[PDB]
Design an enzyme around this catalytic site. Structure first.
Site, PDB file in Angstrom:
ATOM      1  CG  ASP A  73      42.513 -52.628 -11.456  1.00 19.13           C
ATOM      2  OD1 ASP A  73      43.377 -53.467 -11.280  1.00 19.13           O
ATOM      3  OD2 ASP A  73      41.855 -52.515 -12.574  1.00 19.13           O
ATOM      4  CD1 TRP A  76      38.467 -46.410  -9.517  1.00 17.99           C
ATOM      5  CD2 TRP A  76      39.858 -46.035 -11.266  1.00 17.99           C
ATOM      6  NE1 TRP A  76      39.637 -47.010  -9.255  1.00 17.99           N
ATOM      7  CE2 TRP A  76      40.508 -46.796 -10.280  1.00 17.99           C
ATOM      8  CE3 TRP A  76      40.590 -45.684 -12.465  1.00 17.99           C
ATOM      9  CZ2 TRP A  76      41.814 -47.202 -10.416  1.00 17.99           C
ATOM     10  CZ3 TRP A  76      41.892 -46.111 -12.597  1.00 17.99           C
ATOM     11  CH2 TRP A  76      42.510 -46.858 -11.584  1.00 17.99           C
ATOM     12  CG  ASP A 131      45.506 -44.574 -13.141  1.00 16.80           C
ATOM     13  OD1 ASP A 131      45.109 -44.865 -11.945  1.00 16.80           O
ATOM     14  OD2 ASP A 131      45.173 -45.231 -14.098  1.00 16.80           O
ATOM     15  CG  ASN A 180      38.536 -51.230 -10.338  1.00 18.58           C
ATOM     16  OD1 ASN A 180      38.333 -52.203 -11.154  1.00 18.58           O
ATOM     17  ND2 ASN A 180      38.694 -51.359  -9.029  1.00 18.58           N
ATOM     18  CG  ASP A 181      38.194 -53.867 -15.256  1.00 17.20           C
ATOM     19  OD1 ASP A 181      38.839 -54.098 -14.147  1.00 17.20           O
ATOM     20  OD2 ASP A 181      37.269 -54.536 -15.647  1.00 17.20           O
ATOM     21  CD1 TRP A 236      39.950 -44.919 -13.547  1.00 23.66           C
ATOM     22  CD2 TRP A 236      39.349 -43.568 -15.252  1.00 23.66           C
ATOM     23  NE1 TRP A 236      38.658 -45.221 -13.900  1.00 23.66           N
ATOM     24  CE2 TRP A 236      38.252 -44.399 -14.928  1.00 23.66           C
ATOM     25  CE3 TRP A 236      39.192 -42.642 -16.275  1.00 23.66           C
ATOM     26  CZ2 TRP A 236      37.025 -44.305 -15.578  1.00 23.66           C
ATOM     27  CZ3 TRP A 236      37.996 -42.562 -16.917  1.00 23.66           C
ATOM     28  CH2 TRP A 236      36.938 -43.382 -16.565  1.00 23.66           C
ATOM     29  CE1 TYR A 265      47.582 -47.581 -12.769  1.00 21.81           C
ATOM     30  CE2 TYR A 265      48.838 -49.645 -12.855  1.00 21.81           C
ATOM     31  CZ  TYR A 265      48.099 -48.719 -12.144  1.00 21.81           C
ATOM     32  OH  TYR A 265      47.914 -48.885 -10.798  1.00 21.81           O
ATOM     33  CB  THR A 321      46.307 -46.210  -8.639  1.00 20.40           C
ATOM     34  OG1 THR A 321      46.127 -46.757  -9.897  1.00 20.40           O
ATOM     35  CG2 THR A 321      45.055 -45.438  -8.294  1.00 20.40           C
TER      36      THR A 321
END
EC number: 1.4.9.1
Length: 124
Positions: free
Chosen positions: A26, A51, A70, A98-99, A102, A113, A116
């Site tokens: 994601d 995740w 991430d 996954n929302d 991380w 963010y 990933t």
């Protein structure tokens, strides 16, 4: 093509959303902004959090456990965006959610963010 069709992994282009390891990605692929399939780009912070997903390697016919960590402390790359949800569970089962951002564990407290990575953490 047909956003509602069963996932069909490939194993020939890591910058594409159907690359086998991205089955539960994601965000953005790090390989598109200076990183690699498993390393962070320069300047970003590697999270300790992740995740996970178990994704099918079409090449070997196996499944491996993917830890989606991430790279953080930067604004979103905007290159190579994907959202795959192979076996993704609700927020109440975060291990496979996954929302969630991380970024936990990145140095300097980076929580923004950027992208990933898709490192393999083990079979199956």
């Amino acid at each position: 093509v047909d956003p509602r069709a069963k996932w069909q992994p490939q194993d020939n282009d890591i910058q594409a959303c159907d690359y086998w390891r991205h089955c539960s990605i994601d965000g953005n692929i790090c390989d598109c902004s200076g990183g690699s399939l498993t390393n962070c780009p320069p300047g970003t912070k590697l999270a300790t959090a992740s995740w996970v997903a178990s994704c099918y390697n079409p090449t070997d016919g196996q499944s491996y456990l993917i830890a989606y960590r991430d790279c953080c402390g930067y604004n979103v790359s905007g290159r190579c965006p994907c959202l795959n949800t192979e076996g993704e569970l609700p927020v109440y089962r975060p291990e496979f959610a996954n929302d969630i951002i991380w970024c936990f564990g990145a140095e300097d407290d980076a929580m923004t963010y950027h992208c990933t990575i898709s490192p393999i953490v083990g079979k199956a």
